[PDB]
């Protein structure tokens, strides 16, 4: 589809975690908290596309990429390197290979942008 499986399950577990009543439907009150955990602190999401009042995971993994294909993804990948850049303007010499070894995945990270 248009959303990858790596973050589908991340949405599935977050939804099933805050779906405290197990009904498979989530309320607006908790919905704000699931996104702050998912990485969004929005302003007013009360505008949504639901059936009558609440939304299920079917309504979740559709509403979410609508709010995920908006992000300044470039504004974030830069921020992630700032977490590692000691002084400034120097991302990492060896940490790039290391910090990618065990966070989510590591299989022959193309060693482009080398010391050239």
């Amino acid at each position: 589809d248009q959303l990858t499986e790596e973050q589908i399950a991340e949405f599935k577990e977050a939804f099933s975690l805050f779906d405290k009543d197990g009904d498979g439907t989530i309320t607006t009150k908790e919905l704000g908290t699931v996104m702050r955990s998912l990485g969004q602190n929005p302003t007013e999401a009360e505008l949504q596309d639901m059936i009558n009042e609440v939304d299920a995971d079917g309504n979740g993994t559709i509403d979410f990429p609508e709010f995920l294909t908006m992000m300044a993804r470039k504004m974030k990948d830069t921020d992630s390197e700032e977490e590692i850049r000691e002084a400034f303007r120097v991302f990492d010499k060896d940490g790039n290979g290391y910090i990618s070894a065990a966070e989510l995945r590591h299989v022959m990270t193309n060693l482009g942008e080398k010391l050239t």
């Binding site: 975690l17 498979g24 955990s37 998912l38 299920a56 590692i84 990618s100």
Partner: protein, 731 residues
């Protein structure tokens, strides 16, 4: 379109309502059965432990304890202190823990360094320091027996004699719940198996029991539109099938299979000798309810279409069939349920004609709908006819007093001979049951689980002076619904194992030993996957990780080797010295399965001499890794729910500290946020991201405060989140 459940689950006060009177009648005498409170007895032993630390310090004999055991006392005291709320009672504990710090830093300075890496890692450093063989060392009870030179009360004796195997059984609720769910992580070498003086002790069932006794009684509320609440109209059987003898394909038990131009099957199920009409009305009305809500529930089965439910003269049924063919009703009128289903709906899930490709996906289909409908509120207690009343209890140690180990499965092949799991998916749906019937004094529960509802007697429980029988078991009356819940989960997964074992035995008979071990290796993998898929449906845990959490507690190699051994008959042709020589390969640390019965040649262990049993006569099942796998499965599910519960209870505190609803200092607010990270699921990142966001917001409410302790443990969460935003952004 919509996808949700018609069941909202919550909590209640007590399940002990309309229960049988808590009384054992022994020889005219009537013996009252009394609850021994878990949490009240737990705190007593901790208070004795704390008072005994004082006697240990005053005795100066700190060197008579191995540093590893002192490191336990210190780390627990440090962990128990941060779990404490008020600063006055918290510092009394820290007062006790400081001499163990000035001793370790002065005399054993390398141990001091190692645990000091743990204290910067977690508010409960003991839960990680006990991720290994150190958890089998009961340091708390060791100190009590050494320095509390005073006999324990009758209750403290019962608690200790029940939870002797580890000290974690004394931890307060958040620490045990966190330690238990973290004992499945990638860095955990904990398996509940200690070896005593040549004896090997398994206490995987004790983990689940110590977890359930701290829980609250669940309660499931079925919606107004649920199959068991909505008033249903009468079955509209406006059409009557025309029973043709030429199109009579076959006769399955009491069901006539009819061919049909569409290459499907029209099946007619006939009234059995004893079944009333309601049993057939139910199968009709459930298939309709499932066909209706198939999309809404994501049911993967190929449900049959119900056609009619009407009466039929027995002369027509008996005359229509003259094939191979006893079980129908007597003479006059046989009530009928007629349905249409694919040809898959009649090949049992254990058909030797199923390649591993088709079998695997048909097993996955069944386990999906099994647990998806379980959340909906539908329970299937008659999937198979398993016996040892006489029915088989999958989690037997939790439901009975003695119940030392598991049970002997008598048929294990005739038990699943006509299982209600088909290649198409679920079958026989009439034998349904509301999940509420597990949480109430139904005719089901008090008949099959009478001891769990009554209270349990044993001479060791009897108080000669009081005239009553006191036990922790009688505390389960308040919670018995949760026990039968988890037992149902293992019940489902056990029928899958007997089904897979039947399939394995049949296709490996008359067969290349390395090609035969290949079938049994994959069947071990289908069972491990099936259990992991249940954790996903029940907890939202990614199945991939639930499978890794599982493979820390259960050995897929042993399970493959024990199933192949005990589900095939080839071990019958082995002599006594050569049999015990091969059992070492299927256990390899555990004691060999000791048995006395005479081995029936060509079959194996058999009581009736014809059909193989699974275990000696009055002995346990040799499928030991299965017993671990089922207990690991239900402990991950209930243990996750409880961690998430303890997680959310703390998440409120930090929201009331940050929003200003509770006034507290800074270094006591960060303690609230740092403790929330310990209650996050293992491997779950968004939980760790959330408590990172809560932490940054705290450094704005208390910007003047120092962050020496809570720096690195949140930095790694930042580095992990940063490294994911470049890995999850490598599109």
């Amino acid at each position: 379109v919509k996808q949700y459940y018609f069941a909202r689950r919550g909590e209640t006060s007590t399940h002990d309502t309309s229960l049988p009177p808590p009384v054992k009648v022994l020889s005219g005498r009537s013996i009252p059965l009394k609850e021994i409170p878990f949490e009240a007895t737990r705190n007593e032993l901790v208070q004795i432990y704390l008072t005994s630390i004082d006697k240990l310090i005053k005795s100066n004999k700190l060197n008579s304890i191995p540093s590893q055991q002192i490191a336990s006392h210190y780390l627990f005291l440090r962990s128990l202190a941060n779990s404490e709320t008020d600063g006055i009672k918290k510092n009394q504990i820290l007062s006790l823990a400081k001499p163990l710090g000035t001793y370790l830093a002065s005399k054993e300075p390398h141990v001091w360094k190692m645990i000091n890496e743990l204290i910067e890692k977690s508010e409960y450093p003991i839960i990680h320091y006990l991720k290994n063989n150190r958890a089998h060392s009961n340091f708390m009870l060791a100190l009590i027996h050494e320095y509390h030179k005073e006999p324990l009360t009758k209750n403290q004796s019962a608690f200790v004699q029940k939870f002797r195997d580890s000290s974690v059984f004394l931890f307060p609720n958040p620490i045990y719940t966190a330690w238990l769910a973290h004992s499945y992580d990638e860095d955990s070498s904990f398996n509940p198996m200690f070896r005593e003086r040549l004896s090997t002790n398994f206490y995987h069932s004790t983990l689940t029991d110590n977890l359930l006794l701290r829980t609250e009684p669940k309660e499931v509320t079925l919606s107004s539109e649920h199959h068991y609440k909505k008033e249903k109209g009468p079955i509209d059987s406006s059409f009557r099938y025309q029973m043709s003898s030429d199109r009579l394909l076959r006769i399955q038990g009491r069901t006539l299979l009819f061919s049909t131009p569409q290459n499907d099957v029209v099946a007619v199920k006939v009234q059995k000798k004893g079944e009333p009409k309601s049993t057939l009305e139910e199968e009709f009305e459930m298939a309709d309810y499932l066909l209706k809500h198939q999309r809404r529930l994501d049911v993967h089965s190929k449900l049959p279409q119900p056609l009619g439910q009407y009466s039929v003269k027995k002369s027509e049924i008996l005359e229509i069939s003259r094939g191979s063919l006893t079980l129908i009703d007597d003479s006059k009128d046989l009530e009928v349920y007629v349905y249409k289903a694919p040809q898959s709906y009649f090949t049992y899930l254990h058909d030797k004609n199923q390649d591993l490709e088709d079998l695997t996906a048909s097993v996955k289909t069944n386990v999906h709908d099994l647990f998806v409908l379980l959340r909906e509120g539908i329970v299937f207690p008659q999937l198979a006819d398993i016996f040892h009343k006489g029915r088989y209890q999958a989690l037997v140690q939790l439901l009975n007093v003695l119940q030392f180990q598991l049970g002997r499965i008598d048929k294990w092949q005739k038990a699943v001979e006509y299982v209600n799991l088909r290649s198409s998916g679920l079958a026989d749906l009439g034998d349904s049951l509301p999940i509420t019937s597990l949480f109430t004094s139904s005719d089901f529960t008090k008949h099959y689980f009478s001891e769990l509802l009554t209270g349990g007697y044993h001479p060791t429980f009897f108080d000669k002076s009081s005239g009553t029988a006191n036990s922790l078991f009688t505390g389960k009356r308040r919670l018995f619904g949760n026990y039968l819940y988890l037992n149902t989960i293992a019940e489902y997964l056990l029928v899958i194992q007997l089904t897979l074992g039947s399939y394995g035995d049949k296709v490996t008979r008359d067969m290349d030993k390395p090609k035969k071990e290949a079938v049994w290796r994959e069947l071990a993998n289908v069972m491990f996957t099936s259990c992991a898929e249940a954790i996903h449906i029940m907890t939202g845990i990614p199945q991939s990780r639930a499978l890794t959490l599982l493979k820390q507690r259960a050995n897929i190699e042993k399970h493959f080797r024990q199933t192949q051994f005990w589900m095939t008959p080839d071990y019958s042709k082995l002599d006594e010295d050569t049999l015990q020589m091969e059992q070492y390969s299927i256990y390899s640390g555990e004691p060999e399965y000791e048995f006395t019965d005479k081995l029936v040649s060509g079959v194996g262990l058999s009581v009736d001499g014809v059909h193989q049993d699974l275990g000696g006569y009055n002995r346990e099942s040799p499928l030991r890794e299965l017993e671990k796998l089922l207990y690991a499965t239900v402990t991950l599910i209930e243990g996750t729910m409880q961690l998430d519960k303890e997680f959310f209870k703390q998440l409120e505190q930090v929201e009331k500290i940050l929003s200003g609803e509770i006034k507290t200092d800074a270094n006591s607010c960060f303690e609230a946020v740092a403790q929330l990270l310990d209650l996050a699921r293992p491997g779950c990142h968004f939980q760790k991201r959330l408590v990172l966001s809560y932490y940054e917001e705290a450094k704005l409410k208390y910007p003047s405060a120092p962050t020496d302790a809570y720096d690195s443990r949140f930095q790694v969460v930042a580095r992990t989140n940063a490294a994911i935003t470049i890995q999850r952004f490598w599109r």
